[PDB]
Design a protein around this ligand. Structure first.
Ligand SMILES: CCCCCCCCCCCCCCCCCC(=O)OC[C@H](COP(=O)(O)OCCN)OC(=O)CCCCCCCCCCCCCCCCC
Ligand SMILES: CCCCCCCCCCCCCCCCCC(=O)OC[C@H](COP(=O)(O)OCCN)OC(=O)CCCCCCCCCCCCCCCCC
Ligand SMILES: CCCCCCCCCCCCCCCCCC(=O)OC[C@H](COP(=O)(O)OCCN)OC(=O)CCCCCCCCCCCCCCCCC
Ligand SMILES: CCCCCCCCCCCCCCCCCC(=O)OC[C@H](COP(=O)(O)OCCN)OC(=O)CCCCCCCCCCCCCCCCC
Ligand SMILES: CCCCCCCCCCCCCCCCCC(=O)OC[C@H](COP(=O)(O)OCCN)OC(=O)CCCCCCCCCCCCCCCCC
Ligand SMILES: CCCCCCCCCCCCCCCCCCCC
Ligand SMILES: CCCCCCCCCCCCCCCCCCCC
Ligand SMILES: CCCCCCCCCCCCCCCCCCCC
Lengths: 504, 100, 55, 478
């Protein structure tokens, strides 16, 4: 019922942001703020009225809310939305990060701010639609639809200090990676639909109907490979990862584009919701390759993050390492590891949002991102280095932050399933501490290594400090009291895990 | 008592001769001449096929073929005269300014 | 050793191959009409030879 | 077979366009008037477009031993008429700057549209040949309409020589096919063969030579090298017509020929067409990677899109939605090419003499022509097959048809070519918004046409069901 409005309020709000720029240059930011506040309020209302903590696992499908409308009846294609605990958590995180992205671009008084806000709102609506769609064609449609405003944002509103051609190159690489992988996913979807049609006679794209599809072993492996190639591009999984540091480097300086779609993790959700239930035997056969790719992703991302002289690229490779952890968790077939993966995705979203906002404000103060040109910035700034220290402490997995809860439940469940991959991943946590300490030492400690770092810098704004402290409070509360989040996603995770292990 | 294969072979020989003349000649006039040889060979092939089956369809296709040949000769010679007016040469290799 | 992201360059290899193949294929668009006719006859030979081979 | 009054009702757009040719000719003979003759041409084309309704209520019939009128022919007649009307609309502001006679442009456009209608209705080798040349020869005139311009004369000479060569190849192939079969109707090409002897060498050689001619006409590899030169050298409304109407009509008659001929089910012909489609997709996408000229880029784009269409054509005998995919893809490709070539034509109009270059310089177009820049970026996203655009719906149809028929090499070719196309289309679309250093109602009509094409592309990209239902309503004879 409210799910179409959860998708449509961002799109209508973006249209109103574009259109209401004639009334003033400071008007579209209020429209975007009202839009994302309304979307977040609707998501929280769905959380309160859903009763997710009392819901028990009854088997796939089990939706707390559902909407259906015919879209292309010739192919059996519907606007088909459904929400349960995992989808609801991802939608709430999307709404919160959208509010943060609106507030992070509050001071931009550019002549085309309305189109910027329209692109931001359309990216957020596409991400929410990805989390809500249980029609395969609609899921693919949102998956590819949220990449065009992101392309234009990176290419036209991006990092202004860099050349234009670097921004167009990064946006083009991101678009080609994501859309080619999406096309491979479309081929997998089409072949699954055709197998179901030849076995049943019904034109359907409904994920509930495609769950019970009789497939040969090898056909299922290829369909799983197409789905995994799309999700592995957008997770990222090595070696399909370099688009993410290039896109983070050339994103706009505020960081709203970083929070909008580059940081929300739809691929792990797609692996949990689609890859494991549709192809459980193929996923079980693919599990050693997937967890070894996760191990390689953890260590490669950590080593790449240590080798960066750019702080933004360091945070991007930090995301790569964390996603390697989540990818290991997804293929274990363990309830504890899946709940840890959910906590880890939410904690990564919050901590990377804090890191990217603080990096954007550091670049605002000092007009550079090379860590060799800064140093000793603890004595020069009022709030920024301490909050950066908190968020770097969070991303290495300190207890008291949600990252520890996530990665440690992941490692507990994984050790219950696969011990060697678990011990190698914990040494990956040692690597994580190494790169976080290296970033903190290179940026804020020591002596000033240039002239701009040796001067006093203006303090942060009250709104900027307010949302950074909101992220700090949310991360600490997730670290100390993760039980509401665990209870919200318990039934959906249980359904996915029971489907995965009861059909293998 | 003429084999159909012999008439088709004669038409094919004339067709490949016209195509060779179209390729090896730098002059636009000889290219148009080779084009006329090619279309006349194809029309002869249609006439041979129609005469084998005892049908008027071969001569009707011949009629359409020579209508096309006449109109194409008209247009090609107009373009050749325009080329000779605006360039004073019929070298087709010189008419190559659009490439890549 | 890894600071240049070798996996990124390994995945950038298809773009380099595509650029090289496009530059090589653009040599056929030299703008010469007689070569265009020759390529038409070459394609006719190739199509007919393929049809008699696979028949 | 004779002609009945019901057959005359099925003949209605052909008769109306021919009558328009005669009427516009006599009006030019009376007095040279650019506005009146352009108006008479567009009135005749609109009359044929609305006479398609009476054709539909006449029913599907066989009008000649040569023509067959059904929903298939109705759809391609409508597409050809839309392309011709748009060509006239773009042609008027361009011809406003033309110093020599302007009225003959519309006569040639009408005769080429007549050829497209004949190819839509063609059921015979004679009508297929005649429709191809009735399209081609007015295009010889139109491509070299500004023959004082050096590039237009070059394109005219190249197109005339190569199209005469392809016509000779096509006619020789038809003659070999007729020698084998004994009848020139589409359904009898291979009907005198049985017990698995469909691959007769003379029939296959004839169909190979016709494949050479038609693959020239469809810009298919390796008969594709003319396309960027003729697209660049021709006047921009002529480039619009040559990209849309000629390709659509020839592909429709090729669709009908391979549907009706029993030799269309041959394995060797299918493998040869698969090779041609694979090479066409890959080569056309690769060759547009480094193009700074929008016309040559759109020519290589035409090569790739015709490769995708040929992929849909290969699965015609196996799948059931192949011709429905062809119809949806051709509608989307027509509207996208109309928008792109129309923006090029509007920015190239009026014709500024033969001694001044007609270079586009699309960079920074948004800062002086924002609506045209929006239309052109919508067309660039549509030609890339990006969702929310009708080009994506066409690409989806092509991919579904390929997956249904297990044409996995062609499926991988479509994916790889789509990625390469993504690169260069996005390069053009983002170059529209960078920074770089009319006034009559006919120019506004051209802008309205490209804006309506952009709106149609977006609306049918998000809601393609009306177009799908219309295309499925256009069922040819089984
Ligand atoms: C360039 C990027 C894209 C990659 C290239 C494009 C895709 C290539 C796909 C290659 C597929 C090769 C299949 C080879 C065997 C075919 C014959 C066969 O075994 O057919 C079995 C079956 C038909 O018999 P049936 O009675 O229907 O049995 C149902 C079985 N489930 O057949 C079926 O039911 C249909 C089987 C379809 C199998 C899935 C095909 C698509 C899978 C996703 C994409 C490919 C894998 C991921 C990408 C690879 C690396 C790029
Ligand atoms: C311009 C040049 C550059 C650009 C172009 C570059 C090349 C593009 C194309 C690359 C892909 C080529 C095609 C790959 C798919 C091949 C499929 C295949 O061979 O299938 C055979 C068989 C089919 O299954 P079958 O055994 O028939 O099942 C019925 C009974 N069991 O299959 C099986 O039995 C299962 C086979 C599984 C393994 C084959 C697929 C490998 C995929 C490699 C990529 C993904 C690797 C894993 C993930 C990595 C991280 C994402
Ligand atoms: C002992 C027997 C049992 C084995 C237990 C496991 C091994 C225990 C090893 C203990 C000793 C580790 C010492 C690490 C010192 C790190 C601090 C240091 O020296 O920092 C210096 C340098 C500073 O870097 P930066 O921030 O860039 O500073 C700017 C200019 N200096 O910082 C650097 O250059 C970064 C240094 C990173 C060091 C990473 C160490 C990783 C350890 C992994 C252990 C794996 C164990 C298993 C191995 C395989 C077994 C089969
Ligand atoms: C024999 C069998 C049947 C044949 C078909 C039916 C009869 C066809 C008759 C065709 C007549 C052609 C001559 C029309 C002369 C119009 C004169 C006129 O009013 O001109 C005004 C204007 C001139 O141009 P402008 O530059 O604007 O002038 C400024 C100076 N006042 O010009 C204008 O503003 C344009 C005025 C257009 C008027 C005609 C509109 C209707 C045309 C109908 C025929 C079109 C084709 C039909 C095809 C078959 C349909 C079933
Ligand atoms: C898991 C592996 C198996 C499954 C793979 C599934 C596909 C999706 C994941 C892999 C995607 C790899 C894409 C690699 C290229 C990314 C695009 C890129 O780098 O574009 C930027 C570049 C232009 O930038 P620049 O280098 O500055 O150019 C100078 C020219 N003046 O642009 C260029 O230089 C031109 C770009 C041309 C188009 C891109 C290349 C297309 C190649 C085929 C794509 C389909 C995938 C087939 C399999 C490939 C091998 C894995
Ligand atoms: C999707 C966004 C998630 C943000 C982080 C939320 C972390 C959980 C916070 C729960 C509240 C903790 C503090 C209040 C405890 C109330 C105890 C109620 C039972 C007596
Ligand atoms: C994917 C389908 C198409 C989506 C919309 C594509 C864009 C259409 C045109 C909308 C208006 C564009 C305005 C752009 C303004 C850019 C300003 C840049 C300033 C630096
Ligand atoms: C450049 C495009 C490459 C496309 C590769 C597609 C490979 C398909 C392999 C199919 C094998 C089927 C075996 C039965």
């Amino acid at each position: 019922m409210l799910l179409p409005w959860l998708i449509l309020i961002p799109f209508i709000g973006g249209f109103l942001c574009w259109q209401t720029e004639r009334f003033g240059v400071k008007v579209p930011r209020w429209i975007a703020l009202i839009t994302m506040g309304l979307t977040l309020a609707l998501s929280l209302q769905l959380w309160l009225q859903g009763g997710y903590s009392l819901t028990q696992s009854a088997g796939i499908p089990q939706w707390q809310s559902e909407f259906d409308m015919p879209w292309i009846p010739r192919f059996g294609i519907s606007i088909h939305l459904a929400i349960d605990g995992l989808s609801l958590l991802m939608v709430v995180l999307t709404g919160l990060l959208g509010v943060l992205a609106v507030l992070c671009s509050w001071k931009e008084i550019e002549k085309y701010q309305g189109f910027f806000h329209l692109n931001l709102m359309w990216i957020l609506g596409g991400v929410i639609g990805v989390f809500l769609a249980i029609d395969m064609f609609l899921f693919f449609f949102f998956w590819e639809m949220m990449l065009v405003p992101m392309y234009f944002l990176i290419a036209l509103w991006g990092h202004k200090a860099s050349d234009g051609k670097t921004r167009i190159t990064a946006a083009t690489k991101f678009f080609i990676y994501t859309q080619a992988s999406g096309l491979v996913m479309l081929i997998a979807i089409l072949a699954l639909v055709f197998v179901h049609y030849n076995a049943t006679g019904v034109w359907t794209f409904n994920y509930e109907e495609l769950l019970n599809t009789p497939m040969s072993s090898g056909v299922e492996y290829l369909l799983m490979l197409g789905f995994f190639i799309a999700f592995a591009v957008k997770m990222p999984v090595v070696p399909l990862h370099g688009w993410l540091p290039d896109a983070h480097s050339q994103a706009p300086t505020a960081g709203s584009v970083d929070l909008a779609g580059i940081l929300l993790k739809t691929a792990a959700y797609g692996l949990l919701r689609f890859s494991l239930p549709l192809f459980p035997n193929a996923s079980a056969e693919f599990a050693p390759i997937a967890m070894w790719l996760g191990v390689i992703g953890i260590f490669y991302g950590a080593w790449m993050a240590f080798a960066q002289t750019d702080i933004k690229r360091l945070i991007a490779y930090t995301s790569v390492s964390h996603m390697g952890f989540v990818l290991i968790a997804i293929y274990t077939g363990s309830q504890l590891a899946y709940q840890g993966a959910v906590i880890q995705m939410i904690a990564h979203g919050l901590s990377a949002a804090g890191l990217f906002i603080l990096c954007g404000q550091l670049y605002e103060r000092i007009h550079t991102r090379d860590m060799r040109m800064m140093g000793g910035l603890w004595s020069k700034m009022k709030w920024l280095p301490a909050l950066s220290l908190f968020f770097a402490v969070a991303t290495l997995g300190m207890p008291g932050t949600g990252n520890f809860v996530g990665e440690f439940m992941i490692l507990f469940g994984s050790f219950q399933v696969v011990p060697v991959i678990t011990v190698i991943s914990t040494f990956g946590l040692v690597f994580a501490s190494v790169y976080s300490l290296a970033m903190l030492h290179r940026a804020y400690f020591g002596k000033a290594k240039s002239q701009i770092a040796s001067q006093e810098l203006p303090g942060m704004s009250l709104r900027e400090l307010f949302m950074i402290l909101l992220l700090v409070v949310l991360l600490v509360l997730l670290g100390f009291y993760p039980q509401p989040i665990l209870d919200t996603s318990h039934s959906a995770i249980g359904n996915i895990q029971q489907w995965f292990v009861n059909s293998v | 008592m003429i084999p159909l294969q012999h008439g088709l072979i004669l038409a094919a020989i004339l067709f490949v001769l016209g195509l060779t003349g179209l390729v090896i000649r730098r002059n636009l006039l000889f290219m148009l001449i080779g084009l006329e040889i090619m279309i006349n060979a194809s029309a002869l092939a249609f006439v041979v096929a129609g005469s084998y089956w005892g049908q008027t369809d071969g001569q009707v296709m011949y009629i359409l073929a020579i209508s096309l040949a006449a109109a194409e000769a008209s247009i090609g010679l107009a373009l050749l005269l325009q080329l000779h007016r605006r360039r004073q040469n019929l070298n087709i290799d010189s008419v190559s300014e659009m490439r890549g | 050793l890894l600071k240049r992201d070798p996996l990124n360059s390994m995945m950038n290899i298809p773009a380099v191959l595509s650029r090289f193949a496009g530059k090589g294929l653009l040599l056929s668009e030299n703008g010469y009409l007689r070569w265009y006719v020759a390529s038409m006859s070459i394609g006719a030979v190739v199509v007919l030879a393929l049809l008699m081979v696979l028949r | 077979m004779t002609i009945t009054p019901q057959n005359l009702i099925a003949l209605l757009p052909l008769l109306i366009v021919g009558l328009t040719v005669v009427v516009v000719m006599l009006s030019i003979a009376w007095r040279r008037n650019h506005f009146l003759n352009a108006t008479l041409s567009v009135i005749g084309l609109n009359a044929a477009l609305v006479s398609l309704w009476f054709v539909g209520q006449a029913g599907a019939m066989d009008v000649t031993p040569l023509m067959r009128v059904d929903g298939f022919a109705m759809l391609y007649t409508g597409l050809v008429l839309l392309a011709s009307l748009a060509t006239c609309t773009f042609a008027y502001p361009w011809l406003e700057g033309y110093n020599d006679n302007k009225d003959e442009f519309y006569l040639l456009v009408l005769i080429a549209a007549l050829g497209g209608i004949l190819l839509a209705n063609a059921n015979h080798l004679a009508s297929l040949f005649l429709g191809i040349e009735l399209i081609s020869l007015p295009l010889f005139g139109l491509v070299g309409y500004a023959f004082r311009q050096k590039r237009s004369l070059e394109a005219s000479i190249k197109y005339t020589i190569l199209s005469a060569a392809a016509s000779s190849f096509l006619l020789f192939g038809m003659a070999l096919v007729y020698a084998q079969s004994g009848d020139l109707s589409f359904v009898a090409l291979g009907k005198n063969l049985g017990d698995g002897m469909l691959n007769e060498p003379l029939l296959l050689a004839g169909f190979g030579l016709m494949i050479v001619g038609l693959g020239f006409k469809l810009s298919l590899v390796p008969f594709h090298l003319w396309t960027p030169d003729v697209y660049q050298g021709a006047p921009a409304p002529v480039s619009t017509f040559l990209a849309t109407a000629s390709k659509i009509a020839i592909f429709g008659v090729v669709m009908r020929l391979f549907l009706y001929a029993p030799v269309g089910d041959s394995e060797a012909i299918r493998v040869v067409l698969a090779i041609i489609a694979f090479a066409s997709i890959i080569f056309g996408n690769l060759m547009a990677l480094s193009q700074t000229n929008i016309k040559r880029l759109l020519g290589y784009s035409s090569i790739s899109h015709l490769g995708y269409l040929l992929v849909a054509l290969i699965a015609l005998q196996t799948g059931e939605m192949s011709m429905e995919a062809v119809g949806v893809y051709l509608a989307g490709y027509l509207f996208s090419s109309l928008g792109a070539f129309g923006v090029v034509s509007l920015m190239s109009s009026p014709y500024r003499g033969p001694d001044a270059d007609s270079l586009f310089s699309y960079r920074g177009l948004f800062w002086h022509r924002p609506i045209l820049a929006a239309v052109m970026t919508v067309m660039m996203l549509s030609l890339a097959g990006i969702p929310m655009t009708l080009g994506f719906i066409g690409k989806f149809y092509v991919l579904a048809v390929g997956v249904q028929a297990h044409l996995w090499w062609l499926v991988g070719a479509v994916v790889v070519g789509s990625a390469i196309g993504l690169y260069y289309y996005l390069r053009v679309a983002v170059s529209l918004y960078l920074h770089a250093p009319p006034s009559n109602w006919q120019y506004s009509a051209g802008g309205i046409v490209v804006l309506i094409s952009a709106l149609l592309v977006l609306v049918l990209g998000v809601w393609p069901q009306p177009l799908i239902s219309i295309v499925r309503l256009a069922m040819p004879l089984m």
